[PDB]
Amino acid sequence: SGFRKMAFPSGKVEGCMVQVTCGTTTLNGLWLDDVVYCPRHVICTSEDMLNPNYEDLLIRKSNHNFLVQAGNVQLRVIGHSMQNCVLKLKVDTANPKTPKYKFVRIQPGQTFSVLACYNGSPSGVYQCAMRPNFTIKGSFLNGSCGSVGFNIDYDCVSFCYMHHMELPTGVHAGTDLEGNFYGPFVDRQTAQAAGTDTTITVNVLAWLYAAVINGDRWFLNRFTTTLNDFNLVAMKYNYEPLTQDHVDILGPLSAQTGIAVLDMCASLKELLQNGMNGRTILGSALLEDEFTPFDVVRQCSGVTF
Amino acid sequence: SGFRKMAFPSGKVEGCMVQVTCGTTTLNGLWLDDVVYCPRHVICTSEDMLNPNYEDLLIRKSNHNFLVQAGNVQLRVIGHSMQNCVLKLKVDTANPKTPKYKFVRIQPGQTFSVLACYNGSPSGVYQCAMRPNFTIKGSFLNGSCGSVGFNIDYDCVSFCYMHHMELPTGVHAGTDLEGNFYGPFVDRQTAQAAGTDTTITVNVLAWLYAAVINGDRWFLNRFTTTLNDFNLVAMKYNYEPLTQDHVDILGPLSAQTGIAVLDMCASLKELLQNGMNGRTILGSALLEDEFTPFDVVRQCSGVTFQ
Ligand SMILES: NC(=O)N1CC[C@@H](C(=O)Nc2cncc3ccccc23)c2cc(Cl)ccc21
Ligand SMILES: NC(=O)N1CC[C@@H](C(=O)Nc2cncc3ccccc23)c2cc(Cl)ccc21
């Protein structure tokens, strides 16, 4: 019993975190094999950030301008190249702690663990979701750039996020490990804002199933709904549209609890229209949307890594 | 910016998790140096659990009755002893991944990270608090026994909890790494129940200071309170009494925000009376009590968003 916002064990990623320094700027890097990946903005001064020409800033740098520190050991940079918004520093030593890994680009609504780092040293791990507006509500301070997001599938770490910046509302923006931003953001100090966010409907439904599995059923009702009538309600409450794919993905949870997906949608419709009436679900007075259907199945079955 | 329920990076603890098997029972063990620590109930059957005589069950065991598996490697047990509710299995190999560590017994209100494990394999990491009723609201399934709680301040792992059992309300009970249970619990299947739980007042105050540091002040008011009047109101909402130690502990956060501890207490009193009126504090519609003053200072900026 119990249901917690659970992150993947971070050990496989901790063994990849390094400190990258270029001039006065210090941030985090991910050392996999003989390459250190980090935000390309490590080569910018505060003035350069206003309007950077990264290829031009980079051409003025040599390998020795990049100081890479792995624990108390200095790695020597033997090459450098840029791929989108990530700088790839070729080093002379392959990381002996390199896990089995892949670079994957995730979709909004998908969750991942973040290993927050400062000066190449891991400070904490937390779970978050890629919001529909492509931001993450992370917890990051100055120096956290280069911290990464990941999932683990069996023994393979799938790196999906690298931290680049904080937006004016305190939410965060970053890229996949190929340097492509999630969202309409750029790595420059200019007017940028998170668009209006929405609630990840399939995740709220998954968490309602988790609540039922954990013995919380007060919100269940005798009613069902059509997918179109539910979607009319979702649009009204700034909830993401629910698709037939979402319904299919919730099939296993629907079988385990005996509550049809559209039957759980009728419960959600009622919660949106009336509130919780002083009650809580899994210790929360808000409808939680940062657990996917897979996260719920994994936590309610004890999958190991 | 942002405020998350943040766990310590679990790598240092992952390298210590092993699987311990005694007969038909399999659970997790913590391998530090040449010793594997695990719940003594690994030597019990379901039948034994009503009134087990651990000394009598243990005397019937030899070293080779304990199967310890570290990854795909079997460790050889060369000794065993019981210390309170923990079994200590001496093995022939010192764990090469043993971090710098200490065993610390925590007080209610303290937080820690839990690395939930099954069959000696880590499954997930989450942040927990020792409830005032000495239980933890964990996420644990059968096979999770032996999973540990810890803090990692200054590269040293302070192990503070080892999971032993789930109570009828779905909450969890365990011991420190010396095998002393937290709370009035025993490693017996008996009519045991968590006492009435309360809210960790000093932690709610800490999290209100975190909200002020991060830029939110909507809940502040022009009032103050005496410590005694605060406790008289707070106890009516099942909040733990706030002591002078808690007021002293909140000193640094009070200095950083410029809000006196008793002025933050007045805000808390008003929040208990009014609720949030559709508003949230750090993304929550409930008053959060699983962040200590130390956790807030660790996570939050040293510069308040004025
Ligand atoms: N506005 C500006 O010039 N900057 C700031 C530095 C960095 C930036 O957002 N880092 C930060 C990341 N996460 C948390 C922080 C919490 C406080 C401060 C910075 C934080 C950044 C990066 C890019 Cl790609 C663009 C702009 C900027
Ligand atoms: N009542 C009883 O016979 N048992 C059950 C087994 C074990 C026990 O609590 N394990 C479990 C631990 N954590 C989560 C679980 C979630 C579902 C099931 C078990 C779980 C246990 C241990 C002690 Cl010290 C005393 C009694 C018992």
Tab-separated table of N, CA and C in Angstrom, chain A residues 57-189:
chain	number	residue	atom	x	y	z
A	57	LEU	N	30.954	32.230	-31.494
A	57	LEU	CA	31.535	32.154	-30.148
A	57	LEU	C	32.391	30.892	-30.023
A	58	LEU	N	31.892	29.778	-30.584
A	58	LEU	CA	32.553	28.481	-30.532
A	58	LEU	C	33.840	28.437	-31.333
A	59	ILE	N	33.877	29.075	-32.518
A	59	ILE	CA	35.083	29.068	-33.352
A	59	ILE	C	36.291	29.712	-32.638
A	60	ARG	N	36.035	30.646	-31.718
A	60	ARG	CA	37.070	31.313	-30.929
A	60	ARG	C	37.604	30.461	-29.769
A	61	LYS	N	37.035	29.263	-29.553
A	61	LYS	CA	37.426	28.393	-28.463
A	61	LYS	C	38.297	27.256	-28.935
A	62	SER	N	39.219	26.872	-28.087
A	62	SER	CA	40.048	25.711	-28.307
A	62	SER	C	39.573	24.635	-27.296
A	63	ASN	N	40.048	23.403	-27.459
A	63	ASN	CA	39.727	22.306	-26.570
A	63	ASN	C	40.121	22.616	-25.119
A	64	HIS	N	41.311	23.225	-24.903
A	64	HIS	CA	41.814	23.565	-23.569
A	64	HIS	C	41.024	24.681	-22.866
A	65	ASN	N	40.169	25.423	-23.604
A	65	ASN	CA	39.295	26.431	-22.984
A	65	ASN	C	38.166	25.750	-22.164
A	66	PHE	N	37.865	24.468	-22.435
A	66	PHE	CA	36.841	23.718	-21.722
A	66	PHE	C	37.464	22.893	-20.610
A	67	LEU	N	37.124	23.217	-19.365
A	67	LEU	CA	37.619	22.476	-18.224
A	67	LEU	C	36.531	21.503	-17.808
A	68	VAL	N	36.796	20.198	-17.921
A	68	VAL	CA	35.828	19.184	-17.538
A	68	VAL	C	36.367	18.474	-16.312
A	69	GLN	N	35.591	18.457	-15.238
A	69	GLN	CA	36.021	17.829	-14.005
A	69	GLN	C	35.058	16.706	-13.620
A	70	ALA	N	35.575	15.478	-13.513
A	70	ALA	CA	34.812	14.301	-13.113
A	70	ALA	C	35.314	13.932	-11.720
A	71	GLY	N	34.555	14.319	-10.694
A	71	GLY	CA	34.959	14.126	-9.305
A	71	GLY	C	36.155	15.016	-9.034
A	72	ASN	N	37.254	14.443	-8.521
A	72	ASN	CA	38.484	15.207	-8.318
A	72	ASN	C	39.478	14.962	-9.464
A	73	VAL	N	38.990	14.612	-10.666
A	73	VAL	CA	39.851	14.307	-11.806
A	73	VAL	C	39.528	15.223	-12.966
A	74	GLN	N	40.545	15.823	-13.573
A	74	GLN	CA	40.335	16.678	-14.726
A	74	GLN	C	40.377	15.810	-15.980
A	75	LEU	N	39.373	15.936	-16.841
A	75	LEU	CA	39.346	15.222	-18.112
A	75	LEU	C	39.916	16.163	-19.174
A	76	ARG	N	40.709	15.639	-20.127
A	76	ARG	CA	41.226	16.523	-21.170
A	76	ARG	C	40.356	16.457	-22.424
A	77	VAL	N	39.856	17.629	-22.830
A	77	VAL	CA	39.015	17.782	-24.006
A	77	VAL	C	39.901	17.692	-25.249
A	78	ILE	N	39.601	16.754	-26.154
A	78	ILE	CA	40.342	16.559	-27.406
A	78	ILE	C	39.530	16.913	-28.665
A	79	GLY	N	38.313	17.413	-28.491
A	79	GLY	CA	37.476	17.825	-29.604
A	79	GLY	C	36.197	18.474	-29.128
A	80	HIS	N	35.567	19.276	-29.983
A	80	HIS	CA	34.292	19.898	-29.638
A	80	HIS	C	33.479	20.175	-30.868
A	81	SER	N	32.184	19.999	-30.738
A	81	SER	CA	31.240	20.232	-31.818
A	81	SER	C	29.891	20.554	-31.204
A	82	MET	N	29.044	21.197	-31.965
A	82	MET	CA	27.742	21.589	-31.509
A	82	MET	C	26.700	20.810	-32.287
A	83	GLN	N	25.676	20.330	-31.607
A	83	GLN	CA	24.548	19.679	-32.259
A	83	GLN	C	23.330	20.353	-31.722
A	84	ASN	N	22.686	21.189	-32.541
A	84	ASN	CA	21.529	21.959	-32.082
A	84	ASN	C	21.929	22.810	-30.842
A	85	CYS	N	21.237	22.701	-29.691
A	85	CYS	CA	21.598	23.513	-28.535
A	85	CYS	C	22.503	22.800	-27.528
A	86	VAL	N	23.105	21.672	-27.917
A	86	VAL	CA	24.031	20.953	-27.051
A	86	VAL	C	25.437	20.998	-27.637
A	87	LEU	N	26.399	21.166	-26.750
A	87	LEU	CA	27.813	21.148	-27.034
A	87	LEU	C	28.289	19.728	-26.663
A	88	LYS	N	29.027	19.105	-27.565
A	88	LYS	CA	29.570	17.763	-27.376
A	88	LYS	C	31.073	17.891	-27.288
A	89	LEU	N	31.621	17.624	-26.116
A	89	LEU	CA	33.048	17.719	-25.878
A	89	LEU	C	33.648	16.331	-25.887
A	90	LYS	N	34.458	16.033	-26.901
A	90	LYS	CA	35.146	14.759	-26.999
A	90	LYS	C	36.254	14.791	-25.956
A	91	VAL	N	36.331	13.773	-25.099
A	91	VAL	CA	37.379	13.689	-24.087
A	91	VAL	C	38.278	12.471	-24.342
A	92	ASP	N	39.463	12.448	-23.731
A	92	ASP	CA	40.423	11.355	-23.945
A	92	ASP	C	40.138	10.083	-23.136
A	93	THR	N	39.139	10.112	-22.263
A	93	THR	CA	38.820	8.980	-21.409
A	93	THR	C	37.360	8.605	-21.592
A	94	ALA	N	37.077	7.323	-21.850
A	94	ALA	CA	35.698	6.866	-21.926
A	94	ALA	C	35.239	6.687	-20.477
A	95	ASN	N	33.998	7.102	-20.162
A	95	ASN	CA	33.464	6.965	-18.812
A	95	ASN	C	33.310	5.496	-18.489
A	96	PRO	N	34.092	4.991	-17.526
A	96	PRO	CA	33.971	3.568	-17.174
A	96	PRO	C	32.623	3.223	-16.536
A	97	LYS	N	31.911	4.235	-16.023
A	97	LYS	CA	30.601	4.046	-15.425
A	97	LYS	C	29.464	4.263	-16.429
A	98	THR	N	29.753	4.367	-17.748
A	98	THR	CA	28.718	4.567	-18.761
A	98	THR	C	27.702	3.435	-18.722
A	99	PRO	N	26.428	3.724	-18.432
A	99	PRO	CA	25.435	2.643	-18.413
A	99	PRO	C	24.974	2.330	-19.831
A	100	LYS	N	24.127	1.285	-19.993
A	100	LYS	CA	23.450	1.035	-21.272
A	100	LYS	C	22.473	2.233	-21.400
A	101	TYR	N	22.502	2.918	-22.544
A	101	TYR	CA	21.678	4.132	-22.658
A	101	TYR	C	21.152	4.386	-24.040
A	102	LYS	N	20.161	5.255	-24.109
A	102	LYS	CA	19.587	5.741	-25.340
A	102	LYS	C	19.172	7.186	-25.129
A	103	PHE	N	19.108	7.939	-26.216
A	103	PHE	CA	18.590	9.298	-26.196
A	103	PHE	C	17.199	9.186	-26.778
A	104	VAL	N	16.186	9.578	-26.004
A	104	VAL	CA	14.817	9.505	-26.489
A	104	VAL	C	14.157	10.878	-26.329
A	105	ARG	N	13.306	11.242	-27.271
A	105	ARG	CA	12.562	12.475	-27.164
A	105	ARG	C	11.175	12.094	-26.647
A	106	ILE	N	10.748	12.668	-25.535
A	106	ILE	CA	9.439	12.349	-24.965
A	106	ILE	C	8.330	13.295	-25.445
A	107	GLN	N	7.072	12.922	-25.211
A	107	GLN	CA	5.938	13.741	-25.592
A	107	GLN	C	5.381	14.426	-24.345
A	108	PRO	N	4.676	15.566	-24.496
A	108	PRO	CA	4.020	16.170	-23.317
A	108	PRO	C	3.072	15.172	-22.656
A	109	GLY	N	3.045	15.167	-21.336
A	109	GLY	CA	2.256	14.196	-20.593
A	109	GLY	C	3.091	13.027	-20.096
A	110	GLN	N	4.294	12.828	-20.679
A	110	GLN	CA	5.182	11.767	-20.239
A	110	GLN	C	6.010	12.254	-19.049
A	111	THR	N	6.290	11.364	-18.110
A	111	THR	CA	7.042	11.717	-16.907
A	111	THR	C	8.504	11.248	-16.995
A	112	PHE	N	9.351	11.786	-16.125
A	112	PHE	CA	10.744	11.392	-16.059
A	112	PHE	C	11.322	11.863	-14.738
A	113	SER	N	12.454	11.290	-14.359
A	113	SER	CA	13.151	11.683	-13.153
A	113	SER	C	14.215	12.675	-13.520
A	114	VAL	N	14.437	13.649	-12.654
A	114	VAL	CA	15.445	14.659	-12.850
A	114	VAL	C	16.463	14.491	-11.755
A	115	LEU	N	17.731	14.438	-12.128
A	115	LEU	CA	18.795	14.410	-11.145
A	115	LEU	C	19.357	15.822	-11.154
A	116	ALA	N	18.939	16.656	-10.197
A	116	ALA	CA	19.407	18.035	-10.111
A	116	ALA	C	20.867	18.014	-9.650
A	117	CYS	N	21.735	18.762	-10.343
A	117	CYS	CA	23.170	18.811	-10.079
A	117	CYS	C	23.649	20.222	-10.059
A	118	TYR	N	24.720	20.449	-9.299
A	118	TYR	CA	25.402	21.734	-9.185
A	118	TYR	C	26.881	21.399	-9.147
A	119	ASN	N	27.677	22.061	-9.989
A	119	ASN	CA	29.118	21.840	-10.034
A	119	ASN	C	29.484	20.366	-10.275
A	120	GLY	N	28.692	19.697	-11.113
A	120	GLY	CA	28.884	18.288	-11.453
A	120	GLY	C	28.558	17.307	-10.342
A	121	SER	N	27.976	17.790	-9.244
A	121	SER	CA	27.637	16.951	-8.112
A	121	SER	C	26.124	16.838	-7.938
A	122	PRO	N	25.597	15.608	-7.993
A	122	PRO	CA	24.151	15.416	-7.822
A	122	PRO	C	23.681	15.861	-6.448
A	123	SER	N	22.598	16.613	-6.432
A	123	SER	CA	22.051	17.180	-5.210
A	123	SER	C	20.730	16.555	-4.820
A	124	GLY	N	19.933	16.126	-5.795
A	124	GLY	CA	18.631	15.552	-5.486
A	124	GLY	C	17.974	14.943	-6.693
A	125	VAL	N	16.967	14.142	-6.459
A	125	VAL	CA	16.248	13.496	-7.531
A	125	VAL	C	14.767	13.672	-7.289
A	126	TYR	N	14.051	14.024	-8.347
A	126	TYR	CA	12.616	14.187	-8.257
A	126	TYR	C	11.948	13.795	-9.551
A	127	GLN	N	10.679	13.492	-9.469
A	127	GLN	CA	9.896	13.081	-10.612
A	127	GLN	C	9.102	14.292	-11.112
A	128	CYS	N	8.973	14.427	-12.431
A	128	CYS	CA	8.158	15.494	-12.996
A	128	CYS	C	7.597	15.044	-14.332
A	129	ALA	N	6.715	15.840	-14.913
A	129	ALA	CA	6.137	15.543	-16.204
A	129	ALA	C	6.418	16.692	-17.150
A	130	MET	N	6.527	16.361	-18.436
A	130	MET	CA	6.657	17.337	-19.502
A	130	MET	C	5.229	17.891	-19.630
A	131	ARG	N	5.034	19.168	-19.294
A	131	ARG	CA	3.697	19.763	-19.359
A	131	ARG	C	3.230	19.836	-20.815
A	132	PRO	N	1.905	19.896	-21.073
A	132	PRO	CA	1.440	20.118	-22.462
A	132	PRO	C	2.030	21.397	-23.090
A	133	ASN	N	2.410	22.400	-22.267
A	133	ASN	CA	3.032	23.635	-22.790
A	133	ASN	C	4.570	23.533	-22.948
A	134	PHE	N	5.091	22.304	-22.862
A	134	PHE	CA	6.487	21.926	-23.008
A	134	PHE	C	7.435	22.420	-21.931
A	135	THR	N	6.907	22.972	-20.842
A	135	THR	CA	7.759	23.337	-19.718
A	135	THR	C	7.748	22.168	-18.704
A	136	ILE	N	8.630	22.227	-17.716
A	136	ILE	CA	8.604	21.302	-16.604
A	136	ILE	C	8.568	22.173	-15.344
A	137	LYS	N	7.745	21.774	-14.383
A	137	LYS	CA	7.684	22.502	-13.128
A	137	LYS	C	8.781	21.843	-12.299
A	138	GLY	N	10.032	22.219	-12.527
A	138	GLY	CA	11.143	21.611	-11.800
A	138	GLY	C	11.510	22.410	-10.571
A	139	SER	N	12.627	22.059	-9.969
A	139	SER	CA	13.141	22.774	-8.818
A	139	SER	C	14.600	22.923	-9.146
A	140	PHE	N	14.973	24.122	-9.583
A	140	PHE	CA	16.311	24.370	-10.058
A	140	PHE	C	16.762	25.739	-9.659
A	141	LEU	N	18.029	25.859	-9.309
A	141	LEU	CA	18.632	27.134	-8.970
A	141	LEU	C	19.728	27.432	-10.012
A	142	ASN	N	20.381	28.611	-9.918
A	142	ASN	CA	21.493	28.929	-10.806
A	142	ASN	C	22.606	27.874	-10.624
A	143	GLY	N	23.181	27.419	-11.728
A	143	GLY	CA	24.176	26.348	-11.674
A	143	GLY	C	23.608	24.976	-12.008
A	144	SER	N	22.269	24.857	-12.069
A	144	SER	CA	21.628	23.572	-12.358
A	144	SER	C	21.631	23.219	-13.839
A	145	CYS	N	21.976	24.172	-14.746
A	145	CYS	CA	21.999	23.897	-16.185
A	145	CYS	C	22.858	22.674	-16.496
A	146	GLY	N	22.384	21.835	-17.399
A	146	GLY	CA	23.084	20.597	-17.711
A	146	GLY	C	22.571	19.414	-16.914
A	147	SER	N	21.730	19.651	-15.838
A	147	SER	CA	21.109	18.532	-15.104
A	147	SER	C	20.208	17.782	-16.085
A	148	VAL	N	20.042	16.467	-15.906
A	148	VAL	CA	19.296	15.696	-16.896
A	148	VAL	C	18.078	14.978	-16.335
A	149	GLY	N	17.147	14.702	-17.236
A	149	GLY	CA	15.940	13.927	-17.023
A	149	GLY	C	16.078	12.600	-17.740
A	150	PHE	N	15.510	11.569	-17.152
A	150	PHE	CA	15.658	10.212	-17.670
A	150	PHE	C	14.592	9.280	-17.136
A	151	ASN	N	14.467	8.148	-17.808
A	151	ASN	CA	13.658	7.017	-17.403
A	151	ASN	C	14.571	5.787	-17.481
A	152	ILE	N	14.188	4.713	-16.824
A	152	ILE	CA	14.921	3.462	-16.922
A	152	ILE	C	13.955	2.392	-17.404
A	153	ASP	N	14.361	1.644	-18.434
A	153	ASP	CA	13.580	0.544	-18.995
A	153	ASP	C	14.489	-0.673	-18.897
A	154	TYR	N	14.171	-1.584	-17.961
A	154	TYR	CA	14.963	-2.769	-17.619
A	154	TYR	C	16.336	-2.309	-17.060
A	155	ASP	N	17.414	-2.393	-17.843
A	155	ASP	CA	18.731	-1.927	-17.413
A	155	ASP	C	19.227	-0.737	-18.270
A	156	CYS	N	18.339	-0.112	-19.061
A	156	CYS	CA	18.754	0.918	-19.997
A	156	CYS	C	18.243	2.286	-19.601
A	157	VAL	N	19.143	3.246	-19.450
A	157	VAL	CA	18.742	4.613	-19.126
A	157	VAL	C	18.369	5.354	-20.411
A	158	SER	N	17.152	5.862	-20.495
A	158	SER	CA	16.729	6.644	-21.644
A	158	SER	C	16.763	8.108	-21.218
A	159	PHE	N	17.791	8.844	-21.656
A	159	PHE	CA	17.947	10.257	-21.336
A	159	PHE	C	16.989	11.021	-22.238
A	160	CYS	N	16.134	11.850	-21.642
A	160	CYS	CA	15.128	12.577	-22.406
A	160	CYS	C	15.169	14.085	-22.230
A	161	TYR	N	15.897	14.598	-21.232
A	161	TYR	CA	15.885	16.031	-20.990
A	161	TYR	C	17.230	16.505	-20.497
A	162	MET	N	17.624	17.698	-20.896
A	162	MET	CA	18.787	18.370	-20.360
A	162	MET	C	18.311	19.787	-20.028
A	163	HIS	N	18.577	20.232	-18.810
A	163	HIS	CA	18.127	21.527	-18.343
A	163	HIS	C	18.899	22.687	-18.953
A	164	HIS	N	18.194	23.696	-19.482
A	164	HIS	CA	18.841	24.875	-20.060
A	164	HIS	C	18.456	26.176	-19.336
A	165	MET	N	17.154	26.392	-19.034
A	165	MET	CA	16.765	27.691	-18.474
A	165	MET	C	15.525	27.719	-17.621
A	166	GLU	N	15.356	28.831	-16.867
A	166	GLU	CA	14.163	29.073	-16.084
A	166	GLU	C	13.425	30.255	-16.719
A	167	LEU	N	12.122	30.090	-16.935
A	167	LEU	CA	11.247	31.110	-17.500
A	167	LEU	C	10.769	32.091	-16.394
A	168	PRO	N	10.208	33.263	-16.750
A	168	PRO	CA	9.790	34.230	-15.714
A	168	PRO	C	8.777	33.734	-14.682
A	169	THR	N	7.932	32.754	-15.018
A	169	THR	CA	6.977	32.208	-14.054
A	169	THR	C	7.590	31.155	-13.102
A	170	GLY	N	8.905	30.926	-13.178
A	170	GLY	CA	9.567	29.953	-12.310
A	170	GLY	C	9.547	28.525	-12.811
A	171	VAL	N	8.990	28.288	-14.013
A	171	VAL	CA	8.981	26.953	-14.619
A	171	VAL	C	10.204	26.827	-15.534
A	172	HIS	N	10.519	25.615	-15.988
A	172	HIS	CA	11.776	25.341	-16.635
A	172	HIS	C	11.664	24.871	-18.072
A	173	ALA	N	12.718	25.126	-18.833
A	173	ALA	CA	12.784	24.762	-20.232
A	173	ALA	C	14.109	24.124	-20.539
A	174	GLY	N	14.062	23.123	-21.397
A	174	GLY	CA	15.274	22.426	-21.789
A	174	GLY	C	15.138	21.718	-23.111
A	175	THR	N	16.106	20.856	-23.386
A	175	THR	CA	16.164	20.160	-24.662
A	175	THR	C	16.198	18.660	-24.471
A	176	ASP	N	16.028	17.890	-25.564
A	176	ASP	CA	16.322	16.487	-25.516
A	176	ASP	C	17.895	16.404	-25.565
A	177	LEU	N	18.495	15.194	-25.554
A	177	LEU	CA	19.966	15.087	-25.559
A	177	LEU	C	20.591	15.316	-26.929
A	178	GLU	N	19.760	15.486	-27.964
A	178	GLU	CA	20.221	15.899	-29.291
A	178	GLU	C	20.160	17.451	-29.417
A	179	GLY	N	19.836	18.162	-28.326
A	179	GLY	CA	19.811	19.613	-28.291
A	179	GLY	C	18.599	20.276	-28.890
A	180	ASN	N	17.526	19.517	-29.158
A	180	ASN	CA	16.292	20.098	-29.670
A	180	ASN	C	15.441	20.522	-28.484
A	181	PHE	N	15.048	21.803	-28.403
A	181	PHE	CA	14.225	22.267	-27.289
A	181	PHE	C	12.887	21.578	-27.247
A	182	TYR	N	12.379	21.375	-26.051
A	182	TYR	CA	10.994	21.020	-25.864
A	182	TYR	C	10.322	22.400	-25.811
A	183	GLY	N	9.377	22.634	-26.695
A	183	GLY	CA	8.639	23.898	-26.693
A	183	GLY	C	9.246	24.981	-27.560
A	184	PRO	N	8.523	26.109	-27.688
A	184	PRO	CA	8.973	27.180	-28.592
A	184	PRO	C	9.990	28.109	-27.955
A	185	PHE	N	10.967	27.536	-27.273
A	185	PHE	CA	11.960	28.305	-26.548
A	185	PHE	C	13.292	28.396	-27.281
A	186	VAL	N	14.078	29.411	-26.958
A	186	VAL	CA	15.407	29.585	-27.541
A	186	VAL	C	16.422	29.822	-26.426
A	187	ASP	N	17.684	29.457	-26.655
A	187	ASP	CA	18.714	29.653	-25.633
A	187	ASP	C	19.347	31.018	-25.780
A	188	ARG	N	18.584	32.019	-25.372
A	188	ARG	CA	18.970	33.412	-25.427
A	188	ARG	C	18.151	34.171	-24.379
A	189	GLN	N	18.717	35.262	-23.893
A	189	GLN	CA	18.053	36.104	-22.919
A	189	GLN	C	17.186	37.079	-23.687
